[PDB]
């Protein structure tokens, strides 16, 4: 399993709090720090669709 971030709160990278089609400007900030992260691919796949 992999825990992604948006603040100092860990969540599983398959269940994001936000989506691109809901809030577009903040998903890029969500994908900012999560590049050096083994679950960037799962985070992007979960941010693809709701």
């Amino acid at each position: 399993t992999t825990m992604c971030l948006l603040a100092n709160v860990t969540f599983p990278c398959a269940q994001p709090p936000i989506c691109y089609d809901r809030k577009p400007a903040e998903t890029l900030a969500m994908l900012s720090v999560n590049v050096d992260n083994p679950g960037y691919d799962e985070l992007l796949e979960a941010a693809v669709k709701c």
Partner: protein, 412 residues
């Protein structure tokens, strides 16, 4: 298939600088970033500024800030002869092209022709030991590596960043005697002017009149983009802050496939004594790889393109040729020397000379030397014994020779 298309749904297209854009140089919406051509049968994978597939077969390009689209069958490109677009996904187009020095992607929206030529070599890479320019109608199938037509998640990623502040001369304007900055619809901008003191201001959808700075050139009007990405390109200014914000995987990577390779005409093989001759009639140019099956291989490698005749030497230890995409044919020599080994002594010498060339010369030389020394020494001893017989009988003053020693020693 939205699961792998929505990632490029969150980027943008952009405009960038081209060199040859059908009159001089300009900012072209179809600026080519890279052309990677390592697939075999002529498949190239461009990376442009405009995006693709965003709707079935269309291309999506920026045009002075605003985003347009055309169907993909009005986009054409060519290296030396025309190419054929297969598909596209995001920034990446897949094409099929002959070899050339450059690529010119072009379309025509209005009666205004867009182009971009970049000097990137496209090369055509054949499969196998037989060098063709267009793949044959038939042959055999070998392992080749071409760019995969699909768009699946694989190991490769390219990084998309925030866009920079794009400047806009059109955005600045004039009142009766003033300078007015009118942002587009629902759009923030930042304005920087240097006519009086120093001004850095930002608007959010507010047509603001400035009282000072009574020239257009005193003010630079930028534009703000916040929900979109652009590629990490050298043709775009970068935004403040070191955030890269993310990366996307590329379509059309290289994979393992099967390609039909041509098959050469079969040679006409004629044999000789410790020799094999080859009459070779290639259609297109064709490598010939030969080697011996002994401790010293003495291999030979030659790209043959015209009709040729290649006389080789085959010993009793083996020989092997590869002609084209054919398998290796092995040949072995056996003992057929010119001559009869069973008599007529000018024939056995030539038989054992064509069989063993060095040993025959050496053996006949040493046997002739031994026979010569023996005959010369025996004749020397015969003359010595004849002198030793006739020396006492000639010193006598009577000068006679007896009966036995006269004829047996030729004394007279």
């Amino acid at each position: 298939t939205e699961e792998l298309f929505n990632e490029y749904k969150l980027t943008r297209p952009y405009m960038a600088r081209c060199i040859r854009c059908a009159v001089g140089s300009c900012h072209s919406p179809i600026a080519i970033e890279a052309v990677k051509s390592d697939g075999h049968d002529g498949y190239v994978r461009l990376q442009t500024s405009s995006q693709y597939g965003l709707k079935g077969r269309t291309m999506r390009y920026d045009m002075h800030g605003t985003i347009k689209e055309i169907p993909l069958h009005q986009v054409s490109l060519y290296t030396s002869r025309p190419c054929h677009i297969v598909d596209g996904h995001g920034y990446f187009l897949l094409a099929r092209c002959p070899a050339g020095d450059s690529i010119t992607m072009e379309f025509k929206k209005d009666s205004v022709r867009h182009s971009c030529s970049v000097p990137y070599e496209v090369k055509f890479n054949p499969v196998g030991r037989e060098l063709y320019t267009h793949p044959p109608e038939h042959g055999v199938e070998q392992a080749c590596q071409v760019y995969a037509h699909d768009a699946q998640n694989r190991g490769a990623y390219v990084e998309m960043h925030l866009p920079g502040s794009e400047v806009d001369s059109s955005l600045v304007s004039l009142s009766g005697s003033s300078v007015t900055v009118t942002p587009p619809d629902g759009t923030s901008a930042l304005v920087e002017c240097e006519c009086g003191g120093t001004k850095i201001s930002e608007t959010i959808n507010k047509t603001k009149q400035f009282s000072q700075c009574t020239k257009k050139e005193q003010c630079r009007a930028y534009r703000l983009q916040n929900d979109k990405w652009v590629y990490n390109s050298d043709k775009l200014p970068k935004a403040a802050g070191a955030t890269l914000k993310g990366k996307l995987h590329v379509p059309f990577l290289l994979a393992d496939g099967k390609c039909t390779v041509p098959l050469a005409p079969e040679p006409m093989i004629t044999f000789g004594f410790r020799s094999v001759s080859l009459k070779l009639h290639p259609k297109n140019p064709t490598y010939l790889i030969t080697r011996q099956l002994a401790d010293e291989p003495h291999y030979t490698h030659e790209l043959i393109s015209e009709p040729a005749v290649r006389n080789f030497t085959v010993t009793e230890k083996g020989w092997e040729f590869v002609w084209g995409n054919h398998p290796p044919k092995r040949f072995w020599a056996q003992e057929t020397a010119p001559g009869n080994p069973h008599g007529l002594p000018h024939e056995v010498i030539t038989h054992y000379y064509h069989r063993y060339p060095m040993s025959t010369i050496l053996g006949l030389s040493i046997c002739a030397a031994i026979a010569t020394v023996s005959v010369a020494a025996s004749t020397w001893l015969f003359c010595r014994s004849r002198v030793a017989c006739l020396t006492p009988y000639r010193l006598t003053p009577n000068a006679r020779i007896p009966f036995c020693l006269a004829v047996l020693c030729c004394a007279r």
